[PDB]
């Protein structure tokens, strides 16, 4: 019975979906697919597609059946074909597929757009299994594609798309007809799809892309979802369609994105931000239009945006803005961090505590940014070098929390370059440095900073009166240090003493002579490194100093030269 056939089918599908006796359902599913009624053919097909596996008569009947159904035009032929095609798609045997294709062909010849749509979609699933079918069926597609109906076109398209994924060669043959169809579409969805497809065909066949792009953009321009505002974008960005010939397309797409990016919801943003950045790598002009969007994205809360922005910011900068932005990021990260690092608030207006929010490794990037800003071009214009100096010391503080050592390294190298230049600022830097060194926080994690500080002071110990306490600092801290640092400190101090001697004319002052003695005692302490290399490296300097002492005795001014006299001597003795 036709009515029970339909009912069985509903329930049969439930049993067949279990991995249950399909024999009981098959007979029915088959006689059902053999019943001319278009509805039964529809449901039957859905079930058989789940059940057909293994039983031969089942499948066999199902096939020979779908044929008779397809063969006759059928006149509610739209549905009959339509479903029967879907159905056949999910059954696969070569015998079946063989029939199916010959059937889809006849079905494509139905007038009614409904039928023309399904037949197209079906040929999609089928072809995915049995290519011989496609072969005999292609010729028809070309005849159907030329139908006046916009839905049929939309379908022929989708199908040609899948088949492009598998066969592109046949469908690059039909692409021209695809263009002509899209040219006649008024519908927003049909436009969106035809776009996805052409994108797929474009990866294979630029000729299509060129012909189709201009059909898209006229289509997006006429539709407002926004849905195509995203789609055309993803397609434009993908086919790599874009290539520039396609900028115009991309433009409209971007303009639609920019409008959206410009709503505070991460769902739309992220999608745009990504699409933007990507576009920019591809289209600088767009970027310049989207500076504002970027700057705004800096205060965005979305982890992918923030990261995507910083990468954009990096490319976009105004100096006054830089200096400001730096200070701004400093506070953000003390308050944007955490949220999904860990918890989980609800995101409303309400939490008065706000959920808040950064990843975990975004902190490191933040600092890096600061340093970059100071060095791009020559923030020769941090006008206020002071601030930079401060910031640098500050960042060093927070990073002590993170480490990543490299955060801390970059900060140091930069500091050195700052102090070197900018003799003013030295006092601030020295005062801080001196304290930072004896303030333990630098020793924690931070050998690099120490290495730099060491150099800085030798250069500027000339500002400070008591170049004695400084050097007694540094000398007390040397034993607390890593090998890299130790190697540095040693090397620095020596680089310094050479300076004082140049400036000491105060009197030479006797004190400088005493201080050299101290440095000596210290370096002896580092000759006690476990690794022979480092050890030998230090012991080398210890001896060096003891020398400078003898030099100052003979002269005042002549000291730098004197040191280059003895020091190398010692050095050679040891090495010799």
């Amino acid at each position: 019975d036709l009515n029970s056939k339909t009912n069985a089918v509903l329930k049969l599908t439930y049993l067949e979906m279990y991995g249950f006796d399909m024999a009981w359902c098959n007979f029915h599913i088959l006689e059902v697919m053999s019943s001319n009624k278009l509805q039964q053919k529809r449901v039957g097909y859905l079930a058989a597609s789940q059940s057909f596996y293994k039983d031969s008569d089942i499948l066999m009947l199902a096939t020979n059946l779908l044929k008779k159904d397809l063969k006759y035009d059928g006149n509610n032929d739209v549905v009959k074909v339509g479903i029967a095609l879907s159905g056949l798609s999910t059954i696969i045997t070569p015998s079946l597929a063989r029939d199916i294709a010959d059937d889809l062909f006849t079905m494509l010849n139905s007038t009614r757009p409904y039928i023309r749509k399904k037949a197209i979609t079906a040929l999609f699933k089928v072809f995915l299994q049995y290519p011989e079918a496609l072969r005999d069926n292609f010729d028809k597609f070309v005849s159907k594609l030329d139908d006046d109906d916009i839905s049929v076109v939309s379908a022929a398209v989708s199908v040609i798309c899948e088949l492009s994924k598998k066969n592109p060669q046949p469908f690059i043959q039909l692409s021209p007809l695809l263009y002509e169809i899209l040219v006649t579409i008024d519908n927003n969805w049909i436009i969106i799809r035809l776009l996805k497809l052409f994108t797929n065909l474009s990866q294979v066949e630029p000729k299509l892309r060129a012909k189709l792009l201009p059909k898209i953009l006229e289509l997006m321009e006429s539709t407002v979802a926004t849905s195509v505002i995203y789609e055309s974008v993803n397609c434009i960005v993908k086919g790599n369609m874009l290539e520039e010939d396609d900028f115009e397309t991309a433009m409209a797409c971007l303009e639609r994105l920019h409008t959206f990016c410009d709503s505070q919801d991460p769902n739309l943003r992220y999608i745009s931000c990504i699409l933007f950045y990507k576009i920019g790598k591809i289209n600088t002009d767009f970027i310049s239009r989207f500076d504002q969007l970027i700057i705004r994205l800096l205060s965005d809360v979305d982890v992918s945006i923030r990261s995507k922005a910083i990468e954009l910011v990096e490319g976009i900068v105004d100096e006054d803005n830089l200096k400001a932005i730096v200070q701004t990021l400093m506070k953000q990260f003390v308050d944007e961090d955490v949220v999904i690092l860990q918890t989980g608030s609800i995101v409303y207006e309400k939490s008065k505590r706000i959920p808040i929010i950064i990843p975990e490794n975004y902190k490191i990037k933040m600092v890096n940014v600061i340093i970059s800003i100071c060095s791009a071009d020559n923030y020769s214009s941090v006008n206020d070098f002071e601030w930079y100096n401060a910031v640098i010391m500050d960042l060093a503080m927070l990073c002590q929390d993170i480490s990543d050592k490299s955060l801390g390294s970059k900060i140091g190298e930069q500091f050195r370059n700052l102090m070197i230049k900018v003799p003013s600022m030295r006092e601030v830097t020295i005062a801080n440095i001196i304290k930072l060194i004896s303030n333990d926080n630098i020793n924690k994690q931070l050998p690099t900073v120490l290495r730099e500080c060491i150099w800085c002071l030798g250069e500027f110990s000339t500002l400070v009166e008591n170049g004695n306490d400084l050097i007694k600092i540094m000398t007390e801290n040397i034993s607390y240090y890593s090998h890299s640092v130790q190697e540095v400190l040693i090397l620095a101090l020596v680089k310094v003493f050479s300076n004082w001697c140049n400036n000491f004319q105060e009197d030479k002052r006797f004190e400088i002579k005493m201080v050299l003695k101290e440095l000596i005692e210290f370096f002896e302490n580092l000759s006690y490194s476990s690794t022979f290399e480092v050890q030998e490296r230090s012991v080398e300097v210890l001896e060096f100093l003891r020398l400078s002492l003898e030099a100052l005795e003979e002269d005042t001014e002549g000291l730098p030269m004197l040191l280059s006299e003895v020091l190398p001597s010692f050095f050679n003795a040891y090495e010799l």
Partner: protein, 168 residues
């Protein structure tokens, strides 16, 4: 790949669900009832608001922004006049494809059904299903056009009718 399509009435009644790949067969029904509740809490403008959810968010308040993810399953919801459509997709199909396919499915359903009733959708579960598939096939939505989609459904109905005990 869409692994599943969900149709629900404005009053949250499930009615259809498509599942392309193996997923729990029984829980599917239940899961569909759960993700209904959330739909009701979301606002009409935030209609559907695809509900992404960590799973433990199926009736879970460990996280304040309770939502239902159906474990690793993104749920896209769309609200239309009176029907809602939920689509469960895998993380590998494009979100847009999923969204569009939904939006389209909607306009189609409206035109496909002159006066959709929760009941008319039930009986015509297969029909509704077909539309969904057609839209999908060869990865392709091949008619997208709301005018065609409308007929398409009618066509399928005609066929199925002609076959109906194999269908009804």
């Amino acid at each position: 790949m869409i692994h599943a399509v969900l149709i629900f009435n404005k009053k949250c009644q499930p009615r259809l669900v498509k599942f392309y790949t193996p997923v729990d067969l029984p829980k599917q029904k239940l899961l569909l009832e759960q993700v209904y509740e959330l739909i009701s809490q979301r606002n009409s403008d935030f209609q559907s608001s695809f509900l992404v959810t960590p799973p433990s968010l199926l009736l879970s308040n460990e996280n304040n922004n309770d939502e239902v993810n159906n474990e690793d399953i993104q749920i896209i919801y769309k609200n239309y006049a009176t029907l809602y459509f939920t689509f469960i997709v895998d993380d590998q199909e494009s979100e847009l494809a999923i969204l569009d396919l939904i939006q389209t499915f909607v306009e189609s359903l409206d035109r496909c059904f002159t006066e959709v009733n929760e009941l008319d959708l039930i009986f015509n579960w297969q029909t509704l299903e077909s539309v969904l598939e057609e839209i999908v096939q060869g990865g392709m939505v091949i008619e997208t056009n709301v005018n065609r989609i409308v007929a398409s459904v009618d066509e399928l109905n005609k066929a199925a009718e002609s076959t109906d005990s194999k269908i009804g």
